[PDB]
Design a protein around this motif. Structure first.
Motif, PDB file in Angstrom:
ATOM      1  N   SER A  34      -4.604   2.721  -8.745  1.00  0.00           N
ATOM      2  CA  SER A  34      -5.088   3.479  -7.607  1.00  0.00           C
ATOM      3  C   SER A  34      -6.018   2.621  -6.789  1.00  0.00           C
ATOM      4  CB  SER A  34      -5.825   4.758  -8.044  1.00  0.00           C
ATOM      5  OG  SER A  34      -7.193   4.412  -8.313  1.00  0.00           O
ATOM      6  N   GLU A  35      -6.047   2.874  -5.483  1.00  0.00           N
ATOM      7  CA  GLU A  35      -6.900   2.082  -4.623  1.00  0.00           C
ATOM      8  C   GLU A  35      -8.358   2.273  -5.014  1.00  0.00           C
ATOM      9  OE1 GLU A  35      -8.192   4.345  -1.885  1.00  0.00           O
ATOM     10  OE2 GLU A  35      -9.929   3.002  -1.785  1.00  0.00           O
ATOM     11  N   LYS A  36      -8.707   3.383  -5.655  1.00  0.00           N
ATOM     12  CA  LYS A  36     -10.096   3.604  -5.975  1.00  0.00           C
ATOM     13  C   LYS A  36     -10.549   2.677  -7.091  1.00  0.00           C
ATOM     14  N   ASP A  37      -9.807   2.621  -8.209  1.00  0.00           N
ATOM     15  CA  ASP A  37     -10.027   1.647  -9.298  1.00  0.00           C
ATOM     16  C   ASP A  37      -9.700   0.149  -9.061  1.00  0.00           C
ATOM     17  OD1 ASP A  37     -10.334   4.171 -10.433  1.00  0.00           O
ATOM     18  OD2 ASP A  37      -8.341   4.119 -11.381  1.00  0.00           O
ATOM     19  N   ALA A  38      -9.573  -0.307  -7.777  1.00  0.00           N
ATOM     20  CA  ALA A  38      -9.082  -1.671  -7.702  1.00  0.00           C
ATOM     21  C   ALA A  38     -10.159  -2.727  -7.507  1.00  0.00           C
ATOM     22  CB  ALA A  38      -8.069  -1.826  -6.584  1.00  0.00           C
ATOM     23  N   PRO A  39     -10.056  -3.910  -8.143  1.00  0.00           N
ATOM     24  CA  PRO A  39     -11.095  -4.954  -7.948  1.00  0.00           C
ATOM     25  C   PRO A  39     -10.990  -5.467  -6.528  1.00  0.00           C
ATOM     26  CG  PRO A  39      -9.313  -5.739  -9.371  1.00  0.00           C
ATOM     27  CD  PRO A  39      -9.136  -4.277  -9.244  1.00  0.00           C
ATOM     28  N   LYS A  40     -12.117  -5.952  -6.004  1.00  0.00           N
ATOM     29  CA  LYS A  40     -12.136  -6.384  -4.613  1.00  0.00           C
ATOM     30  C   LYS A  40     -11.098  -7.459  -4.309  1.00  0.00           C
ATOM     31  CE  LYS A  40     -15.252  -8.465  -1.208  1.00  0.00           C
ATOM     32  NZ  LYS A  40     -14.422  -9.629  -0.851  1.00  0.00           N
ATOM     33  N   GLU A  41     -10.815  -8.346  -5.268  1.00  0.00           N
ATOM     34  CA  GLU A  41      -9.909  -9.448  -4.958  1.00  0.00           C
ATOM     35  C   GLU A  41      -8.503  -8.932  -4.674  1.00  0.00           C
ATOM     36  OE1 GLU A  41      -9.670 -12.310  -4.021  1.00  0.00           O
ATOM     37  OE2 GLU A  41      -8.111 -13.470  -5.040  1.00  0.00           O
ATOM     38  N   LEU A  42      -8.069  -7.933  -5.451  1.00  0.00           N
ATOM     39  CA  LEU A  42      -6.800  -7.274  -5.169  1.00  0.00           C
ATOM     40  C   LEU A  42      -6.774  -6.735  -3.738  1.00  0.00           C
ATOM     41  CD1 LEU A  42      -4.147  -6.525  -6.485  1.00  0.00           C
ATOM     42  CD2 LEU A  42      -5.147  -4.331  -7.067  1.00  0.00           C
ATOM     43  N   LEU A  43      -7.829  -5.983  -3.349  1.00  0.00           N
ATOM     44  CA  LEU A  43      -7.781  -5.263  -2.083  1.00  0.00           C
ATOM     45  C   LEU A  43      -7.813  -6.218  -0.897  1.00  0.00           C
ATOM     46  CD1 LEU A  43     -10.247  -2.514  -3.287  1.00  0.00           C
ATOM     47  CD2 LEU A  43      -7.829  -2.193  -2.683  1.00  0.00           C
ATOM     48  N   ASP A  44      -8.599  -7.283  -1.006  1.00  0.00           N
ATOM     49  CA  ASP A  44      -8.442  -8.436  -0.124  1.00  0.00           C
ATOM     50  C   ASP A  44      -6.999  -8.928  -0.037  1.00  0.00           C
ATOM     51  OD1 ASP A  44     -11.069  -8.021   0.090  1.00  0.00           O
ATOM     52  OD2 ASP A  44     -11.712  -9.950  -0.778  1.00  0.00           O
ATOM     53  N   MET A  45      -6.358  -9.230  -1.181  1.00  0.00           N
ATOM     54  CA  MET A  45      -4.937  -9.602  -1.163  1.00  0.00           C
ATOM     55  C   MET A  45      -4.091  -8.602  -0.362  1.00  0.00           C
ATOM     56  N   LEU A  46      -4.403  -7.295  -0.482  1.00  0.00           N
ATOM     57  CA  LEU A  46      -3.650  -6.281   0.248  1.00  0.00           C
ATOM     58  C   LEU A  46      -3.894  -6.360   1.733  1.00  0.00           C
ATOM     59  CD1 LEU A  46      -1.721  -4.027   0.517  1.00  0.00           C
ATOM     60  CD2 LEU A  46      -3.501  -2.407  -0.297  1.00  0.00           C
ATOM     61  N   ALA A  47      -5.137  -6.616   2.139  1.00  0.00           N
ATOM     62  CA  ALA A  47      -5.377  -6.697   3.577  1.00  0.00           C
ATOM     63  C   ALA A  47      -4.700  -7.940   4.151  1.00  0.00           C
ATOM     64  CB  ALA A  47      -6.870  -6.727   3.866  1.00  0.00           C
ATOM     65  N   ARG A  75       0.846  -1.164   0.000  1.00  0.00           N
ATOM     66  CA  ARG A  75       0.000   0.000   0.000  1.00  0.00           C
ATOM     67  C   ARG A  75       0.894   1.230   0.000  1.00  0.00           C
ATOM     68  NH1 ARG A  75      -4.866  -0.968   2.161  1.00  0.00           N
ATOM     69  NH2 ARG A  75      -6.346   0.349   1.000  1.00  0.00           N
ATOM     70  N   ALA A  76       0.790   2.032  -1.065  1.00  0.00           N
ATOM     71  CA  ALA A  76       1.675   3.194  -1.301  1.00  0.00           C
ATOM     72  C   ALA A  76       0.716   4.376  -1.402  1.00  0.00           C
ATOM     73  CB  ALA A  76       2.510   2.999  -2.533  1.00  0.00           C
ATOM     74  N   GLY A  77       0.375   4.985  -0.243  1.00  0.00           N
ATOM     75  CA  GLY A  77      -0.498   6.143  -0.264  1.00  0.00           C
ATOM     76  C   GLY A  77      -1.882   5.845  -0.822  1.00  0.00           C
ATOM     77  N   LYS A  78      -2.239   6.455  -1.971  1.00  0.00           N
ATOM     78  CA  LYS A  78      -3.539   6.169  -2.563  1.00  0.00           C
ATOM     79  C   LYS A  78      -3.448   5.036  -3.564  1.00  0.00           C
ATOM     80  N   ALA A  79      -2.243   4.553  -3.833  1.00  0.00           N
ATOM     81  CA  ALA A  79      -1.988   3.532  -4.834  1.00  0.00           C
ATOM     82  C   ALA A  79      -1.689   2.188  -4.244  1.00  0.00           C
ATOM     83  CB  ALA A  79      -0.805   3.976  -5.755  1.00  0.00           C
ATOM     84  N   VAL A  80      -1.971   1.168  -5.043  1.00  0.00           N
ATOM     85  CA  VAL A  80      -1.606  -0.226  -4.777  1.00  0.00           C
ATOM     86  C   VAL A  80      -0.468  -0.565  -5.724  1.00  0.00           C
ATOM     87  CG1 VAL A  80      -2.422  -2.567  -4.557  1.00  0.00           C
ATOM     88  CG2 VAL A  80      -3.996  -0.716  -4.232  1.00  0.00           C
ATOM     89  N   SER A  81       0.694  -0.895  -5.145  1.00  0.00           N
ATOM     90  CA  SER A  81       1.886  -1.208  -5.895  1.00  0.00           C
ATOM     91  C   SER A  81       2.052  -2.706  -5.793  1.00  0.00           C
ATOM     92  CB  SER A  81       3.082  -0.416  -5.344  1.00  0.00           C
ATOM     93  OG  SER A  81       4.288  -0.652  -6.077  1.00  0.00           O
ATOM     94  N   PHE A  82       2.563  -3.355  -6.846  1.00  0.00           N
ATOM     95  CA  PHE A  82       2.605  -4.811  -6.758  1.00  0.00           C
ATOM     96  C   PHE A  82       3.536  -5.389  -7.793  1.00  0.00           C
ATOM     97  CE2 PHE A  82      -0.634  -3.613  -9.826  1.00  0.00           C
ATOM     98  CZ  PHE A  82      -0.311  -4.382 -10.919  1.00  0.00           C
ATOM     99  N   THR A  83       3.681  -6.688  -7.713  1.00  0.00           N
ATOM    100  CA  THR A  83       4.561  -7.471  -8.546  1.00  0.00           C
ATOM    101  C   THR A  83       3.861  -8.781  -8.855  1.00  0.00           C
ATOM    102  OG1 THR A  83       5.646  -9.019  -7.060  1.00  0.00           O
ATOM    103  CG2 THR A  83       6.375  -6.754  -6.971  1.00  0.00           C
ATOM    104  N   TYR A  84       4.286  -9.397  -9.972  1.00  0.00           N
ATOM    105  CA  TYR A  84       3.533 -10.500 -10.533  1.00  0.00           C
ATOM    106  C   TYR A  84       4.563 -11.314 -11.291  1.00  0.00           C
ATOM    107  CZ  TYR A  84       3.558  -7.805 -14.992  1.00  0.00           C
ATOM    108  OH  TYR A  84       3.923  -7.102 -16.087  1.00  0.00           O
ATOM    109  N   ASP A  85       4.135 -12.479 -11.736  1.00  0.00           N
ATOM    110  CA  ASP A  85       4.981 -13.348 -12.501  1.00  0.00           C
ATOM    111  C   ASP A  85       4.468 -13.468 -13.924  1.00  0.00           C
ATOM    112  OD1 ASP A  85       7.218 -15.571 -11.836  1.00  0.00           O
ATOM    113  OD2 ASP A  85       5.663 -16.521 -13.069  1.00  0.00           O
ATOM    114  N   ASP A  86       5.186 -12.838 -14.862  1.00  0.00           N
ATOM    115  CA  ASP A  86       4.801 -12.853 -16.252  1.00  0.00           C
ATOM    116  C   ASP A  86       5.639 -13.961 -16.836  1.00  0.00           C
ATOM    117  OD1 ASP A  86       7.139 -11.362 -16.083  1.00  0.00           O
ATOM    118  OD2 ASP A  86       6.302  -9.596 -17.078  1.00  0.00           O
TER     119      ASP A  86
END
Lengths: 63, 10
Positions: free
Chosen positions: A46-59, A25-36
């Protein structure tokens, strides 16, 4: 099976919730990494545009 | 301006 769509360097992209690794959690943004497939890629939205599953992952990563 | 804001999308 949730998708996350984000702008990287002015380029649109997205990836599966599964493929994600680190969520910070970076201020108003969700910063992340993934495996491509083999490599690791980085992104954010931004935390406002984020799908619920992401925000769950953040909590979850905050314990 | 257009500000083009250059959106700079920055």
């Amino acid at each position: 099976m949730v998708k996350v769509k984000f702008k990287y360097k002015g380029e649109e992209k997205e990836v599966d919730t599964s493929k994600i690794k680190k969520v910070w959690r970076a201020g108003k943004a969700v910063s992340f990494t993934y495996d491509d497939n083999g490599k690791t890629g980085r992104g954010a939205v931004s935390e406002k545009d984020a799908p619920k599953e992401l925000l769950d992952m953040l909590a979850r990563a905050e314990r | 301006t257009x500000x083009x804001x250059x959106x700079x999308x920055x």
